[PDB]
């Protein structure tokens, strides 16, 4: 079943009613190991359950194989299971071999409903919903954000009729509409943290820390699904305005906590690096100036000279920069940026300050968390790598506590290192012209890079993919074409392919830009794997990322080009 926006309180009350007894623990939470939104949502839920004294267990999980293993290994004393960041698309009842009869506790003929020992709650933002979980199952309870009621009526009707069943014509047309619904690609439509914050507001537990976590979760989608962030921004603005004290005339104190809405910028770690490095290592700036070649550096130096900022001053760190220029930055940027085409750098963001400490923005906090996740620190090696990433999850989780600031600083340093490495790898890719421009998609395979050990993590591979997507692909007035990025690792002799959705020119509101673009690589990849003896691993939660053997990539890509479903 599915719980409407207003049923979150009912679901929370059910969880408290069932899995709350000081004798033993009866709650378990599974989290996507490499999703920041799920991390923040689970932190919010952990605080909420700590307040009410509910004993729980949190298990980081990478891939579906680990999910199946851990669910099989669960004890029978667990009354409620929480899945955050996955499970919506797959068939949980079929995948986990859940037989409703075995899990039934008591059945009432008069009520027409059955009671089950276990309950499974799905907190997923991906789409489309698997109609089996939403409408067929009862053990599975899915936290909806209105989609089922807004735009799933016809699918609901078709599925219910199909279960209910000259008739061949009706049956055919109903399976046809169901297949049409299943044919579309995958996309993210909302943020889980927003859902948990709505629950908290429903039960009245919203405070400043919860709002900070909600803002982090929501802003983690800004880079990819900007169209979700743009839709959720007004609610965050209203919440910040409502929670903030009216009077700010009071002076700073060692305990004062501030949460403002100041002008932010599309610059990489502006407040923890030089003004030069923020422009140099920015996706948008590199896209609009082509910094990977010497002409780009010359153009950036020209821009700085025109703005009236000495090169020595710009390269100085943020804290010690000359304060006249720091104060005038808003005026200097606004007249100068439009000329170089970097005008959209101007933006409004969230900045949080703890008394007498440096102020940090939401975007930089998310960047630090992601960097800690990525580089924080036959089948045996794969298991070891996944264990290391599960370990990094806890570093990133600790970095969310104000008592742990050294971890956040360590994350910022690692983020700067990682961005430098990604810049170098992208420069090497573009200089050699390794991108092949086929008619269905673009391809780029790395075979001998200098820093190829970095891209075994899906997060770092997606970072490089976003960098490439923005530069010389978003711009150049070329047709929108999806891109495939693959990388090799000699230690295991396999590829980590990763399809990437194209993105419209940033900050260009238009009717066509309003429409979202889906990711069809999951369907094509699964079809090809089923048809060919691929040996592909499709266990990753993001269905667009798989693993291939060294000698199968050429047949796989040939069949991909010949498929035409991309």
């Amino acid at each position: 079943m599915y719980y409407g926006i207003s049923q979150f309180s009912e679901a929370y009350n059910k969880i408290l009613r069932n899995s709350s007894s000081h004798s033993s623990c009866q709650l378990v939470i599974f989290v996507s190991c490499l999703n920041i939104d799920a991390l923040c949502a689970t932190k919010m839920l952990s605080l909420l359950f700590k307040k009410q004294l509910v004993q729980s267990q949190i298990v980081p999980i990478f891939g579906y194989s680990e999910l199946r293993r851990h669910y099989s290994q669960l004890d029978d004393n667990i009354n409620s299971l929480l899945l955050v960041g996955f499970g919506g698309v797959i068939d949980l009842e079929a995948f986990l071999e859940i037989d409703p009869q075995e899990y039934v506790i008591d059945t009432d003929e008069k009520s027409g409903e059955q009671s089950f020992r276990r309950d499974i709650y799905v907190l997923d933002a991906h789409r489309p919903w698997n109609l089996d979980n939403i409408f067929g199952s009862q053990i599975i309870q899915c936290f909806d954000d209105g989609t089922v009621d807004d735009t799933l009526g016809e699918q609901k009707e078709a599925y219910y009729k199909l279960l209910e069943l000259q008739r061949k014509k009706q049956i055919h047309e109903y399976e046809g509409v169901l297949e049409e619904y299943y044919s579309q690609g995958t996309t993210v439509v909302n943020s889980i943290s927003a859902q948990i914050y709505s629950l908290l507001s429903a039960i009245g537990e919203t405070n400043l820390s919860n709002l900070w976590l909600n803002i982090l979760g929501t802003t983690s989608l800004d880079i990819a699904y900007a169209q979700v962030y743009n839709r959720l921004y007004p609610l965050l603005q209203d919440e910040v305005k409502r929670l903030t004290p009216s009077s700010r005339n009071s002076v700073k104190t060692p305990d004062t906590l501030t949460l403002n809405i100041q002008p932010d910028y599309y610059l990489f770690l502006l407040r923890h690096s030089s003004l030069y490095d923020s422009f140099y290592y920015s996706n948008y700036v590199n896209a609009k100036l082509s910094l990977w070649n010497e002409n780009g550096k010359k153009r950036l130096h020209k821009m700085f000279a025109r703005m009236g900022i000495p090169l020595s001053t710009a390269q100085e760190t943020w804290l010690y920069m000359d304060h006249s220029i720091k104060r005038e930055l808003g005026i200097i940027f606004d007249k100068n940026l439009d000329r170089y085409g970097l005008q959209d750098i101007i933006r409004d963001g969230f900045v949080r300050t703890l008394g007498y400490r440096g102020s940090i923005s939401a975007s930089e906090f998310v960047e630090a968390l992601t960097a800690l996740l990525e580089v924080g620190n036959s089948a045996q090696k794969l298991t070891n790598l996944r264990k290391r990433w599960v370990s990094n999850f806890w570093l990133s989780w600790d970095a969310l506590d104000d008592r742990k600031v050294e971890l956040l600083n360590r994350g910022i340093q690692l983020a700067q290192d990682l961005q430098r490495a990604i810049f170098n790898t992208g420069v090497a890719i573009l200089e050699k012209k390794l991108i092949k421009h086929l008619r269905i998609y673009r391809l780029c395979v790395l075979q001998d890079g200098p820093d190829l050990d970095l891209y075994r993590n899906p997060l770092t591979l997606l970072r490089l993919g976003n960098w490439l997507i923005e530069c010389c692909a978003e711009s150049e007035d070329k047709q929108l074409l999806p891109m495939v990025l693959a990388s090799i690792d000699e230690n295991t002799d396999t590829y980590l392919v990763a399809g990437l959705t194209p993105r419209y020119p940033r900050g260009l509101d238009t009717i066509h830009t309003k429409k979202p673009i889906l990711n069809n690589f999951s369907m094509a990849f699964q079809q090809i794997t089923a048809e060919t003896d691929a040996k592909v691993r499709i266990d990753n939660f993001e269905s667009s990322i798989i693993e291939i053997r060294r000698e199968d990539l050429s047949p796989f890509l040939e069949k991909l080009t010949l498929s035409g479903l991309l």
């Binding site: 709350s20 000081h22 004798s23 004294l53």
Partner: protein, 222 residues
């Protein structure tokens, strides 16, 4: 003399602090500890009974936490007592061996403590007699000799300095001073000095001199 559970806990804490700070091994409070252990068992049974059966959540938490606190206090008290018995094993054996001495271990120790004393003494004596003593001549073959160059039996540091708080009676020894406040008078024979111990004050005194006041409960070590 039983009064109430609160008073029993208060005396338990008094004994715990005094034992922790005292240089000697104080007498064991047999009746208090018996009452406390019996109450612990009964309260554990009551908690289990209630648990076997949401407004009732907090009381159970409080009862369990209080049981943990009481168990911790008793645990630390007994552990300190055992350590002191370890340090002063030969001294207590000497007390028991002498018949003119008033103190007897059956009053100064519990059954568990006396069992520990005997067993550990036997074990250690076995070890040392195997390792070392069996090679020395018959003269140096005693683990408790006091007629040699150095005395082998360690006695408590009688004159150790201990912080005390004078809290008065819950009195013949009490008197008043020039300023009119109640006070106690004690003599330090080594220095021939007389020291005033006004009520409600903190002093760093020798243990020997204020030992009787501590025994009568007129002062409590901090």
């Amino acid at each position: 003399i039983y009064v109430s559970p609160q008073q029993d806990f208060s005396d338990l804490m008094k004994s715990w602090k005094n034992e922790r700070c005292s240089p000697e091994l104080l007498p064991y409070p047999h009746q208090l500890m018996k009452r406390l252990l019996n109450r612990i068992s009964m309260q554990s049974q009551l908690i289990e009974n209630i648990s076997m059966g949401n407004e009732s959540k907090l009381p159970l938490l409080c009862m369990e936490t209080e049981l943990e606190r009481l168990k911790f206090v008793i645990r630390s008290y007994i552990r300190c007592r055992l350590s002191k018995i370890d340090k002063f094993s030969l001294y207590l054996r000497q007390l028991n061996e002498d018949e003119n001495s008033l103190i007897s271990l059956t009053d100064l120790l519990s059954k568990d403590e006396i069992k520990y004393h005997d067993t550990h003494s036997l074990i250690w004596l076995k070890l040392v007699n195997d390792s070392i003593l069996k090679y020395m001549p018959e003269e140096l073959q005693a683990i408790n000799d006091t007629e040699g160059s150095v005395n082998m039996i360690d006695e408590p540091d009688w004159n150790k300095f201990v912080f005390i708080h004078v809290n008065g009676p819950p009195d013949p020894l009490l008197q008043e001073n020039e300023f009119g406040k109640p006070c106690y008078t004690v003599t330090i024979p080594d220095l021939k000095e007389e020291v005033e111990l006004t009520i409600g004050s903190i002093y760093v005194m020798r243990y020997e001199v204020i030992r009787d006041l501590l025994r009568d409960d007129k002062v409590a070590l901090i």
